A = this chain, B = another copy of it.
Amino acid sequence: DVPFVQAYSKFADDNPRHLRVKTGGKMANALTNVIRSYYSINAPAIVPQV
């Protein structure tokens, strides 16, 4: 599992855990939110610039 741990840590800024659901971290949330914003002008677009 060593190659997967490195890839997940880079993507999610946290080590994978057996008892925590693998969600992708804050990058996954930001990617999901920008997709909503691109589709329509009425989307919230709440992701900070920082």
Interface residues on A, range: under 10
Interface of A is mostly: loop
Contact with B along A1-34 (1 / 0, CB 8 A): 1001100100000001111001000000000000
Identical chains in the assembly: 5
Taking CB atoms, residues of chain B closer than 8 Å to A8 are 18
What would be 10 A-B contacts, judged by CB atoms less than 8 Å apart? Answer: A1-B17, A1-B18, A1-B19, A4-B18, A4-B19, A5-B18, A8-B18, A16-B18, A18-B18, A18-B22
Chain B residues with CB under 8 Å of A17's CB are 1
Report the minimal beta-carbon distance from A35 to chain B, rounded to whole angstroms.
Answer: 23
A-B residue pairs, 7 tightest by C-beta? A1-B18, A16-B18, A1-B17, A4-B18, A4-B19, A1-B19, A5-B18
